[PDB]
């Protein structure tokens, strides 16, 4: 079954977006149709997964003679799925037998004929709270368009026989012929590997049909759904033939345009008008200049003065294509916390042709760019900052990428004064350097590194988190790893490299609970008992 997501213009758009649609995964919106403007523009739609909004219907008959189940993955305002109000002489909804989630609101329809006699008790189920049916089993069209009462466990609309392989519309989902209460599971647990593994028999879920592959522009979601568009917190990644809704690593990639190329093409600086167009943006393409006229405000460009707290909108930029010149920062702020996450200033286009990450004539305490890793092409001139001390520590050669890149960090707070005032890298910071004057803002960690922090010693033997060093970086051992006092509590990450199990230990794995009722191979749920030694024994 094919699936689809001015008065004359409305008629054309509706007839286009619902011409051959059989199951409308979106919401049927048949509203504002002038008299004698359509003819069966949507007649075969057999299940709409949302709200059927039939309002402002001047036409005598919008057929909708096929819709049998209006799913209810939304509502009009609340619990309102079929919105038949403010209309229309006859609507043959003889097919609609079950609206799974929601209720029907009828009113403001003087022309509505034969609709009041509908036995709407069978239509909606258990959501009668907003059943505003105030505006004989027959949904119009005289006889043979009867209401066909059926409601007054995997079959929703009706039964073609009491067999789960023969049902009109699936209550939850349908693999191919039998309607299952859930999709064919994406990954099944194999007791041999003692872990869940991708079952070949499993299929992704598309609407109400379990699909082996996500068709057309559909991406597999985390919950297994074949969503047409990935969520805002997710990203589209193609590892197999079907793209997957991989969750975003913090700020999702939203490549905005920078000050100089794009909508901000002729802007002079990051004006208060220019800002807030870069919110929730990463990998700005072009420069990200922040000149003094931004905080002063401008008239000949009619730019209102920028509130200092709004410069934190630029904290999500994890890369830049062109230069990143920060030539004036809010004076009350000690460190360039605006660019605290800029991971690589690729510097394809260099401000003044030379500088790629320049921080000139600011009054910051520390460069504050803890997270920077590669200033690829252009140079790096960080001068003028008369109160920046913990600057020269970071090795300006480990960062720059093209051998022609130079560095002119000069004229800042003196090294002797930086040392006398105690403005030095925290002891738990390797000789590589420290971007800020604190321990977490260190270029390289001396011994271990719990997260971004450059700790002095990982909790290898004593500690609350039970750290277990790995590639010179502390990593929280799996919570199931019971801390061990004699030696290291965890050889490596994952519950299969732990010394002592806090909870039961299931085979090579230390699991919070033994696998009980988890679906395994051969479509069998697996229930495992636990031994006295915290060993999970399968039943």
């Amino acid at each position, epitope marked *: 079954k094919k699936v689809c997501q001015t008065f004359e213009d409305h008629f054309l758009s509706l007839q286009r977006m619902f011409n051959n649609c059989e199951v409308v995964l979106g919401n049927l919106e048949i509203t504002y149709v002038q008299r004698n403007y359509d003819l069966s523009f949507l007649k075969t739609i057999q299940e709409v997964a949302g709200y059927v909004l039939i309002a402002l219907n001047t036409v005598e008959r919008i057929p909708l003679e096929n819709l049998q189940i209006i799913r209810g993955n939304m509502y009009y305002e609340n619990s309102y799925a079929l919105a038949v109000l403010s209309n229309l002489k006859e609507l043959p909804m003889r097919n609609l037998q079950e609206i799974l989630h929601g209720a029907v609101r009828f009113s403001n329809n003087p022309a509505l004929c034969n609709v009041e006699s509908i036995q709407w008790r069978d239509i909606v189920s258990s959501d009668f709270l907003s059943n505003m049916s105030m505006d004989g089993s027959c949904w119009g069209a005289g006889e043979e368009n009867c209401q066909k009462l059926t409601k007054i466990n995997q079959c929703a609309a009706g039964c073609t026989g009491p067999r789960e392989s023969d049902c009109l519309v699936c209550r939850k989902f349908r693999d191919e012929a039998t309607c299952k209460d859930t999709c064919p599971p994406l990954m099944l647990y194999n007791p041999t590997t003692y872990q869940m593994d991708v079952n070949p028999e499993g299929k992704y879920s598309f609407g109400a049909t379990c699909v082996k592959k996500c068709p057309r522009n559909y991406v597999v979601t985390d919950h297994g759904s074949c969503v047409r568009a990935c969520g805002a917190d997710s990203y589209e990644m193609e590892e197999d033939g079907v793209r997957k809704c991989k969750k975003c690593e913090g700020p999702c990639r939203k490549v905005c345009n920078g000050i100089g190329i794009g909508e901000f093409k*002729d802007s*002079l600086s990051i004006n208060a008008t220019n800002i807030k167009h870069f919110k929730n943006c990463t990998s700005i393409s072009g420069d990200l200049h922040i000149l003094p*006229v931004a905080f*002063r405000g*401008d*008239s*000949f460009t*009619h730019t209102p*003065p920028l509130d200092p707290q709004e410069l934190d909108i630029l904290k999500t930029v994890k890369e830049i294509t062109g230069f990143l010149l920060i030539q004036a920062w809010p004076e009350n702020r000690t460190d360039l916390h605006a660019f605290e996450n800029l991971e690589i200033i690729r510097g394809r286009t260099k401000q003044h042709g030379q500088f790629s990450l320049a921080v000139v004539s600011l009054n910051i305490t520390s460069l504050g760019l803890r997270s920077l890793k590669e200033i690829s092409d252009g140079d790096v001139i960080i001068s003028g900052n008369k109160n920046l001390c913990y600057a020269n520590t970071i090795n300006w050669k480990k960062l720059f990428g093209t051998s022609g890149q130079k560095t002119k960090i000069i004229s800042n707070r003196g090294e002797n004064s930086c040392k006398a005032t105690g403005q030095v890298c925290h002891a738990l910071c390797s000789p590589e350097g420290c971007w800020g004057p604190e321990p977490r803002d260190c270029v390289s960690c001396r011994n271990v590194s719990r997260g971004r922090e450059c700790v002095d010693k990982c909790n290898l033997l004593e500690g609350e988190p039970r750290e277990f060093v790995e590639n010179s970086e502390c990593i929280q051992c799996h919570p199931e790893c019971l801390p061990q006092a004699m030696n290291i509590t965890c050889t490596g990450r994952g519950p299969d490299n732990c010394i002592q199990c806090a909870h039961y230990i299931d085979g090579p794995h230390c699991v919070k609970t033994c696998p009980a009722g988890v679906m395994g191979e051969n479509n069998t749920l697996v229930w495992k008992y636990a031994d006295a030694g915290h060993v999970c024994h399968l039943c």
Partner: single-chain antibody, 234 residues
Framework: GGGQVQLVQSGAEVKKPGASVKVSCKAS????????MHWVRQAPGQGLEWMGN????????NYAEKFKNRVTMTRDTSISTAYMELSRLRSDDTAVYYC???????????WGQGTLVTVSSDIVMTQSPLSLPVTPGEPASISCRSS???????????LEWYLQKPGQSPQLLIY???DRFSGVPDRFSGSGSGTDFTLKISRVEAEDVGVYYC?????????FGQGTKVEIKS
């Protein structure tokens, strides 16, 4: 002096018809690359008519419609100075040309000395009074009408009332429609709304005698009024 922001213009230019003149406004006491050295010209018998901005640091100049093909403005960030060259000098282009410096909320904050270039062979704001005389101490009032609504889309009505005191460069006297700039006496306090604006000098002393040109820059080309030459009763 206190190295206060003090633009200084070239001055004393006399040309021949059809020639070109280049003017330079040597800035001082400011970051000459952070303030748009907007230019403005008021010919004998005319009000403040902008000649097109600049961004002295980047050299990227907007320009004035009636001179877009004749006036090119290029900056020299090294010498801390803006330069604007007017080409094909006609007869009607003989004037005194000033070099403003668009401030934060107050355009043309620190106007230069002004160069007199004599070569000889748009929201329209008109000032209600003209040569409006008042007696020493007598309250006065100059009003001005806007061709359109001069409240900008930004919501800040960039109307202002510069006050060219006799013999000096124009000097802001109302930063916005209502607020007064720092250094103006409490007497001069105008107001207005919509398209009508009026300055009301509370007590016209001997210090307020001079053409009070009224500018409105909320529209793209910065166009001012003709201004009412408030003069003493005499």
């Amino acid at each position: 002096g206190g190295g206060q922001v003090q633009l200084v213009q070239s001055g004393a230019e006399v040309k021949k018809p059809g020639a070109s003149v280049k003017v330079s406004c040597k800035a001082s006491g400011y970051t000459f690359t952070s303030y748009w050295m907007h230019w403005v010209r008021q010919a004998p018998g005319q009000g403040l008519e902008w000649m097109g901005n600049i961004w002295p640091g980047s050299g990227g100049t907007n320009y004035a419609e009636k001179f877009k093909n004749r006036v090119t403005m290029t900056r020299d960030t090294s010498i801390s100075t803006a330069y604007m060259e007017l080409s094909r000098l006609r007869s009607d282009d003989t004037a005194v040309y000033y070099c403003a410096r668009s401030g934060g909320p107050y355009f043309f904050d620190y106007w230069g000395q002004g160069t007199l270039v004599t070569v000889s062979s748009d929201i329209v704001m008109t000032q209600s009074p003209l040569s409006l005389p008042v007696t020493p101490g007598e309250p006065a009032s100059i009003s001005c009408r806007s061709s359109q609504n001069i409240v900008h889309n930004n919501g800040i009505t960039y109307l202002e009332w510069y006050l060219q005191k006799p013999g000096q460069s124009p000097q802001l006297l109302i930063y916005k429609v209502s607020d007064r700039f720092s250094g103006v006496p409490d007497r001069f306090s105008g107001s207005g709304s919509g398209t009508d604006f009026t300055l009301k000098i509370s007590r016209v002393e001997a210090e307020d005698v001079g053409v009070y040109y009224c500018f409105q820059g909320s529209h793209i080309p910065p166009t001012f009024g003709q201004g009412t030459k408030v003069e003493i009763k005499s």
